[PDB]
Amino acid sequence: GTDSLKNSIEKYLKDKKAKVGVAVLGIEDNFKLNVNEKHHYPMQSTYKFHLALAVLDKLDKENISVDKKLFVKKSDLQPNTWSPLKDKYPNGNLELSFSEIIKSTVSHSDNNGCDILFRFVGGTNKVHNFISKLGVKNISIKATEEEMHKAWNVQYTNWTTPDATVQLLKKFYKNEILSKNSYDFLLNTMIETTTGPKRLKGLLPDGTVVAHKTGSSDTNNKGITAATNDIGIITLPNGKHFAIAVYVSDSSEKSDVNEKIIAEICKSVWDYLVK
Amino acid sequence: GTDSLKNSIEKYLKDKKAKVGVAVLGIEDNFKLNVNEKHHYPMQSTYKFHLALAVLDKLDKENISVDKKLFVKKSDLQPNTWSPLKDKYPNGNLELSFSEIIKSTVSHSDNNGCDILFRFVGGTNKVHNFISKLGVKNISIKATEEEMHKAWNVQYTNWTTPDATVQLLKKFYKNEILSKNSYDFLLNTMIETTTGPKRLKGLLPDGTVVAHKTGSSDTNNKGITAATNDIGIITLPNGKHFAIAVYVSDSSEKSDVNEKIIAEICKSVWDYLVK
Ligand SMILES: *C(=O)N1C[C@H](NOS(=O)(=O)O)CC[C@H]1C(=O)NOCCN
Numbered sequence: 441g442t443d444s445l446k447n448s449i450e451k452y453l454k455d456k457k458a459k460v461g462v463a464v465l466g467i468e469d470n471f472k473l474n475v476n477e478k479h480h481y482p483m484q485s486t487y488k489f490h491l492a493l494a495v496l497d498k499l500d501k502e503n504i505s506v507d508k509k510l511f512v513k514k515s516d517l518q519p520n521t522w523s524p525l526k527d528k529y530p531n532g533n534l535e536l537s538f539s540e541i542i543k544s545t546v547s548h549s550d551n552n553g554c555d556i557l558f559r560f561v562g563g564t565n566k567v568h569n570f571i572s573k574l575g576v577k578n579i580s581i582k583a584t585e586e587e588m589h590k591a592w593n594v595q596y597t598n599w600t601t602p603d604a605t606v607q608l609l610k611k612f613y614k615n616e617i618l619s620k621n622s623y624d625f626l627l628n629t630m631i632e633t634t635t636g637p638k639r640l641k642g643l644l645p646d647g648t649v650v651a652h653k654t655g656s657s658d659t660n661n662k663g664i665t666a667a668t669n670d671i672g673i674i675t676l677p678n679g680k681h682f683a684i685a686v687y688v689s690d691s692s693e694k695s696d697v698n699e700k701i702i703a704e705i706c707k708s709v710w711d712y713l714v715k
Numbered sequence: 716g717t718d719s720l721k722n723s724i725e726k727y728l729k730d731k732k733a734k735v736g737v738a739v740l741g742i743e744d745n746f747k748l749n750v751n752e753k754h755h756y757p758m759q760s761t762y763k764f765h766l767a768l769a770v771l772d773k774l775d776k777e778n779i780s781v782d783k784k785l786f787v788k789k790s791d792l793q794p795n796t797w798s799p800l801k802d803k804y805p806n807g808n809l810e811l812s813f814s815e816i817i818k819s820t821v822s823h824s825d826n827n828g829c830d831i832l833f834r835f836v837g838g839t840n841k842v843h844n845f846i847s848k849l850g851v852k853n854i855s856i857k858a859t860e861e862e863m864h865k866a867w868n869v870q871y872t873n874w875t876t877p878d879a880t881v882q883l884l885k886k887f888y889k890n891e892i893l894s895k896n897s898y899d900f901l902l903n904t905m906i907e908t909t910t911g912p913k914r915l916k917g918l919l920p921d922g923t924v925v926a927h928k929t930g931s932s933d934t935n936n937k938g939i940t941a942a943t944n945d946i947g948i949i950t951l952p953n954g955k956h957f958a959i960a961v962y963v964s965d966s967s968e969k970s971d972v973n974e975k976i977i978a979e980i981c982k983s984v985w986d987y988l989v990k
């Protein structure tokens with residue numbers, strides 16, 4: 441039962457030197473599980489999911505095709521950050537579609553793409569309000585990637601509870617947020633995600649569909665990695681779905697262990713739900 | 716004359732809110748120019764040039780082909796840093812040649828590749844000593860990319876004078892450091908560099924050969940960008956060469972202006988040397 445799975449997870453976490461937030465919500469059925477869920481966890485790149493929702497909603501509502509192109513200035517592509525876009529287009533100063541920018545932002549976690557889209561959409565407070573007005577409490581979106589890169593503590597202003605994340609993912613999945621078209625596009629993009637292959641996906645059978653979004657922080661001079669996260673919707677072998685979110689925060693563990701925590705917890709929920 | 720070029724550069728720098736270090740050394744002739752050269756500038760990624768020298772020297776001396784492969788563990792490919800390798804190989808755990816790793820490290824500034832190679836070569840102190848024993852004073856190599864990412868001030872321990880950089884580049888170029896084979900390989904790799912196209916190269920004629928290596932820091936909460944650098948060897952239209960190094964340090968300027976400083980100073984030296 442849910443209780444026993446939960447006790448298994450808590451016992452697993454006993455000897456891990458990190459503050460680990462877990463939530464699971466069945467999509468089609470009533471399954472629900474929360475562990476350490478009343479803390480505020482730094483989202484890092486996970487909030488590119490939320491940004492993508494606000495962007496596509498804005499494109500939908502204002503009737504703007506995702507094939508329309510922004511001019512991406514050289515200066516939008518900062519060297520001082522994770523950015524496959526910048527490596528693909530080192531000169532910048534070119535026209536890129538919303539589609540290409542979103543795909544790089546979500547599937548490849550582009551930091552520049554993220555901030556290009558915050559600017560397009562009208563800033564962090566626009567996304568913060570958008571998510572809020574969907575009826576999901578306990579998500580704070582306050583800082584761009586550039587803002588977070590300036591100072592360690594800024595990441596903690598972009599925070600969430602893990603149960604708000606899976607409430608949001610479930611709303612998304614049951615297409616309560618977007619048009620059909622934009623829904624399919626974001627969903628595909630999340631399945632096509634290439635980052636964190638040994639996180640949620642790490643110990644599930646080969647080929648399991650995991651539509652997800654990672655996030656990761658740096659480590660400070662005290663050995664603390666603020667955030668090692670993965671959030672997503674996973675397809676069970678009978679075609680049903682669950683939303684899951686895991687936040688490994690303020691960890692003294694090494695990165696292999698931080699990812700393993702996510703993979704093992706996910707594997708434990710998977711095993712329980714398949715039966 | 717050299718003096719007047721120098722006064723032009725100093726006058727240019729007058730209204731730039733940054734501490735800018737410049738050195739130029741003719742390769743074949745006696746041209747020499749230094750501006751603010753007695754300060755210690757944070758190298759950032761420029762020190763991947765120095766690392767590559769130590770690596771190739773170690774491969775040369777120990778008779779190890781650059782086509783031999785390291786096993787790159789998942790954990791060598793940290794998500795929390797600029798890394799085209801990691802995006803190309805998200806699962807990690809594969810065999811990569813020294814050649815592929817060096818190319819990504821130098822030409823595409825891979826941070827993971829850098830630290831993989833520090834470990835191969837035997838650590839920062841091995842590279843520090845190697846450079847020292849070449850007869851080039853005033854270069855300090857103390858910290859890996861992972862070490863620098865933990866704390867703001869760590870970058871200042873990897874420091875250089877700009878005239879040590881061009882002394883080093885000149886030694887390299889006149890093939891006083893490596894075997895023929897490893898020389899050609901590093902030189903090609905530096906020409907194939909794709910980063911910072913609007914730095915040294917930014918205002919020179921199209922097609923000018925610039926064998927170079929960039930580096931860039933983050934910006935802190937006070938608006939200071941610690942480092943915006945480019946170092947290289949440039950081919951004049953009569954086939955002669957000059958080494959140049961520019962360090963735009965502790966700048967309150969925006970990134971466009973920081974790069975422009977490098978491009979305009981380089982353009983001024985180019986124009987003087989072509990005549
Ligand atoms: C996201 O969390 N990012 C961007 C990128 N992707 O990582 S991942 O989403 O976990 O795969 C690199 C890590 C992180 C950063 O934003 N890293 O920058 C350091 C934080 N100031």
Ligand SMILES: *C(=O)N1C[C@H](NOS(=O)(=O)O)CC[C@H]1C(=O)NOCCN
Nearest residue numbers: 519520759760797824864910929930931
């Ligand atoms: C090098 O300076 N790097 C690595 C990468 N390349 O930039 S570039 O060499 O200027 O083109 C990104 C910037 C920089 C970093 O190491 N960035 O990380 C932040 C410093 N802790």
Ligand code: NA
Nearest residue numbers: 588592594595
């Ligand atoms: Na931060």
Ligand code: NA
Nearest residue numbers: 863867869870
């Ligand atoms: Na640093």
